[PDB]
Amino acid sequence: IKRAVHALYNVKAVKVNTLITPLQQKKAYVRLASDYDALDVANKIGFI
Amino acid sequence: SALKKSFIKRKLAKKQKQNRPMPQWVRMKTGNTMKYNAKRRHWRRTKLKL
Amino acid sequence: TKGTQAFGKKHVKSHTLCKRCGKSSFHIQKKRCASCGYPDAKKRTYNWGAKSIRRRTTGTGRTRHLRDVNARFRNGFREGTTPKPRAQ
Amino acid sequence: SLRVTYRRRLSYNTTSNKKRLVKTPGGRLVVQYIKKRGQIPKCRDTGVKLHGITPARPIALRLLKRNERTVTRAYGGCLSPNAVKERITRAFLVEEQKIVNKVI
Amino acid sequence: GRGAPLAIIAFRDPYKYKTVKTTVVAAEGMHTGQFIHCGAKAQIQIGNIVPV
Amino acid sequence: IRKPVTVHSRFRAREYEEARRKGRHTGYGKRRGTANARMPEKTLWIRRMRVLRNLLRRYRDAKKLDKHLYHELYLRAKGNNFKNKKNLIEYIFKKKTEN
RNA sequence: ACUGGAACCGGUACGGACUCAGGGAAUCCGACUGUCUAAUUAAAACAGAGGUGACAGAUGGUCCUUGCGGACGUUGACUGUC
RNA sequence: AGGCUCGGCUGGAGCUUCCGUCAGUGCAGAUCGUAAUGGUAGUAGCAAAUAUUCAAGUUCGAUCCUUGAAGACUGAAGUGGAGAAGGGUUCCACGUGAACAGUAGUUGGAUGUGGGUCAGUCGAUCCUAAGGUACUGGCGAACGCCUUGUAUCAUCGGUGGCGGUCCCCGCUUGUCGAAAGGGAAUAGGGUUAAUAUUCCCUAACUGAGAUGCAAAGAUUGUGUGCACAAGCGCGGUAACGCAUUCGAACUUGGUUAGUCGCUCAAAGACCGAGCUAGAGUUUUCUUCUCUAGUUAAGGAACGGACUCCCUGGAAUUGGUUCAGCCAGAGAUGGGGACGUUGUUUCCGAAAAGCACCGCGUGGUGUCUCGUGCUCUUUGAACGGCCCUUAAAACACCAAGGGAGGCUAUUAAUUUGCACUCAAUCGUACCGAUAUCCGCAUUAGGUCUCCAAGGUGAACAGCCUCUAGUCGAUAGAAUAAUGUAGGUAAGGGAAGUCGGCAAACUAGAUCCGUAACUUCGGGAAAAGGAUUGGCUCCAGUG
RNA sequence: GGAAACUCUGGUGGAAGUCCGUAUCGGUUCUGACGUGCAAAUCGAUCGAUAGACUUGGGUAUAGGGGCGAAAGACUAAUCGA
RNA sequence: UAAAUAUCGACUCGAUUGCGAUAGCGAACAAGUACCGUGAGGGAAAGUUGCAAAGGACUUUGAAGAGAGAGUUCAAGAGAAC
């Protein structure tokens, strides 16, 4: 997930948490480094 | 149980997905006979003998 | 006391899910499936269980490869060739 | 008063689940788990406890400073001073008697 | 399960640098720190193992 | 708002304890456990032994008893010859006068 | 903190509620503690410690297994089973 | 007669005469099969677990949902707070009409739509136990079985040199099996409708790493900056202490092993005395009643029972515990050594939490003491018991050994800091008089942890505080019979198969206690007296 | 106290398949309740035991003419003289 | 060592003096399904509006179910469980 985030959005991650939801879907919480802004990256991606 | 196995969790997830009301637009298909989901399950009445 | 009182102690599963047949008939302590005989190499079937044979026999699943072979047999198992190159 | 609850999923009072009630800065009474305590070693010859050796769990012995596992003496940390004294005396006297017998 | 005490005895391996421990039922009067002599040339003493 | 807790005062208990210390509510009709359950004779004996041995240790340290008299009185105290500190002190004084 | 004692006071009464064996003389059976017919029998039944007897010195005894083999046995008569 | 024809109404697609021939060819029954429906009958019944009431909100609609006030209950071995197995979304929010919630329902564990489970440190993962299962080997007509054992067996891997290899050293063994055994390392505060040792903040720790920086190694003695010599550390009589001044194969060890009893200590809880801050009560009294006055992991410094060392030489024997027990095999005395539990006018850290007063984000305080046959937990040190003696592996550490290694301003080699990373899976909730098993929202069953005040011997019974409940279809009335409680004149087992049932007895202190006896008992034998409140006296440190 | 053997008195100590009794485990009597039940064995009171031959979770072993049995033909998933 | 022979289990076809939804395969249909048992295993019920959804717009009472009008239709007394 770390490498995929870096390669897809050109953003570095400081930590990745993962869980599997009751519907067997893997959900990841990726904390970006303080250099980047999560709101800006989300705006660029589209989900906002 | 809270401390379970991944395979059991997978089976439970599939059962959860299957336990769902039938889409309403299915009744408008040509030749349709299904009026509801006849395989719904209640956690307290019928138990998955896993 | 045999009955209502005794049924309250039933909370340890004798059988679990089998890897080969997916049934909840894998005996944990015996380490064998009471239905398909896993992990024996061979399958568990008995002629006195005619209905069980019917339930678990060929054709009750997908028979994906058998149907594929049947389809390919009709033309002699031809390989390495393509239809005549044509267009619309 | 204030009553506590286990913080792990082990609910049995086993040797691995020994607890101690502690008051936190937030005014709460909580459970703090006690690890197994180390034991002072014994002599190889006798069973008396050795001195100058810091007890610790076997895996935690690796973290101690060098001086806490040894004593500046032959067999230090393996034998008691009296055991070493007896060994030295026996070693000397038995060989002296062997020399006498060889002469004889 | 046994009514007679066992004696743990240590011998020296004759062919390699090692110690070999023997577990035998103790004869009455045997004590820790005692020396047991086993063989054809051992004397008649309590605890010695000798040919009959 | 967080309402105040319901009041549960110990005032009556404190007053009753003051009365008990003065000596009330302790007659025979107020006792439900045996004498040994209310005050173990083992605990009473432990207190007595510690008191007597401390007194003897103090005297020997202050050189008021030599080792021989100290030993004799120590064993007598263990043998239950002195009911209390006053008894022991009186006996010591008498024996020292005789000596 | 507990113990002993004395005056005075009241009232139907003072372990004031609460908690907690009625007692005794005999006969029969089983010594005792214990166990048991889950869902009609908790016993005088079974067990029991104690007693006696039998077999067995291992190339043995008593058992199981279709067979191979295995259990008592990490045992050896103060042992093992019956 | 079996049956048939026609009329009328319903219905919407097939039916039929006669001749042969064929048959799964005719029902009132079979405690017949199957489907449906009656009288019973608006009947039996919806009665265990103390209990609800007033005002208001919402709603078409309220005994039952929500708010407030009151009254009660569980009563810390709970109707409280969390877990293991099991369930599997029942968790949370917003809608809800029908069905279900044996009355109702605006409510719901129901129904519709969405949301929710975040870990290097908690577990699994890792080790092995009882035991399972393979190999070969034997057997077996065969699927396959039997043994887990010298039966079988040519089962390898370790240091060093060389750079695959040679020397030497030993001798062989699989693999599963525990979210209660063993085990690397995390704590506090805050945050969400629902996650929290996981997220945020702050502060730590463990393991695997190469690289970099700093300091060591890198001196001493003698003679006169130079010369010669000197290895791998020093102190203490000792128990041992201090620095980091190397070291392999191999060998031998350490790493609390039961249960019960008594003493002691620490922490938490509880209980007092004040001092603040806020509440409550004041016809009258009370310096009054209640609440808050907290300090994590990790560090530094101290402390530590037992045991050990030195001196010395003990009978007129001493020391000593509640109980033991210890001493010419070295006591007492005197002086020292060690160390787990733990403590702090110390860091963490008051910038937190808590209590209170303000404003539209501020301020103030968070302090001094005591006490104990008190409980829980931890620890120390001993005693009793056994024809009962209370795991194994992994891993780490230590010692003996001295193969080897670097060569006094070099080097080997440790030390400390600085950097990188720590995968995978579980994580919501219930855990039971409604989330489990019992056909169910069933008076049943189902493994554990925490545990306040009073009375009292007490985790007894009874009352109360924190927390939680008022959920058991409701109303009126109180006939007979009933179920469950409470009494009864005089008699006192006359009742009955039978004293069945009920009644009687009981706590504690003092006194007294028979036959018989296996001498231990019988025994609480039997049987008497006392018991409250208040004011004092005496004893026990 | 005694010539001795030894005896007596007061403490300490805390043994026992000891006793009363709570949690807990059982299930005696009422031949109580209920008996188309809360319940295909439950409910109330009264009772047996309560530091051991104790009570229990999980993991394991024993499988049908077999197992297991402190022995009732008991138990072996509401099924047991197969 | 081919042929003549066996056999519809598999794949592909043609028929019938057979049954016509309690019949015929257990299953004409989301049938080896729902559901039950720890397990081996057991195992259903369930066909039909109309030619065509044209599946009842709109008004009206009611919170709503629903009703009264109306409309579609050969016909709705064929109105969805038809």
Q: How far is the CA of F59 from the C1' of H208 (A)?
A: 67
Q: Identify whether the C-beta of residue B22 lies closer than 8 Å to the C-beta of residue B39.
A: no
**CA atoms of F85 and F69, how far apart (whole Å):** 17
Q: Identify whether the C-beta of residue C35 lies closer than 8 Å to the C-beta of residue C23.
A: yes
Q: Which of A18, A19, A21, A23 to mutate to test the interface with B (most CBs of B within 10 A)?
A: A23
- H-helix or E-strand spanning residue C68: helix C64-73
Q: Is the dihedral of CA C16, C22, C23, C26 positive or negative?
A: negative
DSSP sequence for D57-94:
-TTGGGGS-GGGG--SSTTBTTB-HHHHHHHHHHHHHH
In which residue are the tokens 């502690």 written?
D22
Question: What does the buried/exposed string (b/e) look like for C40-58 if buried means 16 or more CB atoms within 10 Å of the residue's CB?
Answer: eeeebeeeeeeeeeeebee
All residues at 6 or more sequence positions from C23 whose CB lies less than 8 Å from its CB, including other chains: C17, C33, C35, C36
User: Looking at CA atoms only, how far is residue B49 from chain C in angstroms?
Assistant: 7
Q: Residue C49's closest CA among C32, C60, C36?
A: C36
**CA atoms of D45 and D79, how far apart (whole Å):** 7
- H-helix or E-strand spanning residue B47: none
User: Looking at CA atoms only, how far is residue B50 from chain C in angstroms?
Assistant: 6
**CA atoms of D84 and D74, how far apart (whole Å):** 7
What's the start-to-end Cα distance of chain C, in Å? Answer: 82
**CA atoms of A40 and B13, how far apart (whole Å):** 34
Count of alpha carbons within 13 Å of D81, Cβ hemisphere only?
Answer: 5
Q: How far is the CA of D10 from the C1' of H371 (A)?
A: 38
- For B49, which residue in chain C has the nearest alpha carbon? C24
Cα F99 versus chain centre, distance: 30
Amino acid letter, D7: R
3-class SS at D49?
strand
Q: Identify whether the C-beta of residue C36 lies closer than 8 Å to the C-beta of residue C46.
A: no
**CA atoms of D23 and D32, how far apart (whole Å):** 10
Question: What does the buried/exposed string (b/e) look like for F2-38 if buried means 16 or more CB atoms within 10 Å of the residue's CB?
Answer: eeeeeeeeeeeeeeeeeeeeeeeeeeeeeeeeeeeee
All residues at 6 or more sequence positions from D39 whose CB lies less than 8 Å from its CB, including other chains: D55
**CA atoms of C67 and C59, how far apart (whole Å):** 10
- Residues of chain A with C-beta less than 8 angstroms from the C-beta of B13: 22-24
Q: Identify whether the C-beta of residue F95 lies closer than 8 Å to the C-beta of residue F81.
A: no
**CA atoms of B19 and B45, how far apart (whole Å):** 14
3-class SS at A41?
helix
β pairing state of E6-12 and D29-33: unpaired
Q: Identify whether the C-beta of residue F56 lies closer than 8 Å to the C-beta of residue F35.
A: no
Tell me the Ramachandran region of residue C58: left when phi exceeds 0, alpha when psi lies from -120 to 50, beta otherwise.
beta
- Residues of chain B with C-beta less than 8 angstroms from the C-beta of C16: 50
Quote the DSSP letter at residue C9: G
3-state DSSP helix/strand/coil percent for chain A, to nearest 5?
35, 30, 35
- For B7, which residue in chain C has the nearest alpha carbon? C17
C2 touches strand I (CB under 7 A): yes
Q: Take residue B2 and report the two structure tokens written for it.
A: 């809270």
**CA atoms of F49 and E45, how far apart (whole Å):** 54
F82: the nucleotide nearest its CA (via C1') is I11
State the angle between helix axes of F85-98 and F67-78 in degrees (0 to 180), rounded to the nearest 10: 140
